[PDB]
């Protein structure tokens, strides 16, 4: 129910590496800012510290994998403001048409430094797609969060 499996853990660990650019096992504010800006955002140094802070359970300044996994376990359960998820959707939906295509996901992942085959891309779409049109619309993006 509320339980992440062995493979769900491995997928989160993989995701964690997107943010941990140097693979030292911690996300710094600097690494967060570079991810944020690669997604069209522009947080300030203080905003980046606030972000880290909501997640930084041990107060050491960085996010390790356990802290990341904790935040993700929790975010899987909770519901966000319509406009928090709307802003997230807009990063993927580059042409504003209301549908995240495989190409748009490929663009976002590439800009994030990620090496994706289009069987890996189609499969990501496959998981989020509810109606079967081969794209991700807003409703399906919501349900996914």
């Amino acid at each position: 129910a509320d339980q992440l499996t062995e493979e769900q853990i491995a997928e989160f660990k993989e995701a964690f590496s997107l943010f941990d650019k140097d693979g030292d096992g911690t996300i710094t504010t600097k690494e967060l800012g570079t991810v944020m800006r690669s997604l069209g955002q522009n947080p300030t140094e203080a905003e980046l510290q606030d972000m880290i802070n909501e997640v930084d359970a041990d107060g050491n300044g960085t996010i390790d994998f356990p802290e990341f996994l904790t935040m993700m376990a929790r975010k899987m359960k909770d519901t966000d403001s319509e406009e928090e998820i709307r802003e997230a959707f807009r990063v993927f939906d580059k042409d504003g048409n209301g549908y995240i295509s495989a190409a748009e996901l490929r663009h976002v992942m590439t800009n994030l430094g990620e090496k994706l085959t289009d069987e890996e891309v189609d499969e990501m779409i496959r998981e989020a797609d509810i109606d079967g049109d081969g794209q991700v619309n807003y409703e399906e993006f919501v349900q996914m969060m």
């Binding site: 989160f12 997107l18 944020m36 955002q41 972000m51 993700m72 998820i85 997230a88 890996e120 969060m145």
Partner: peptide, 14 residues
Amino acid sequence: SKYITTIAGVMTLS
């Protein structure tokens, strides 16, 4: 994959 969910998850921290 948990890329999209974590990207959105991180967005939400802001």
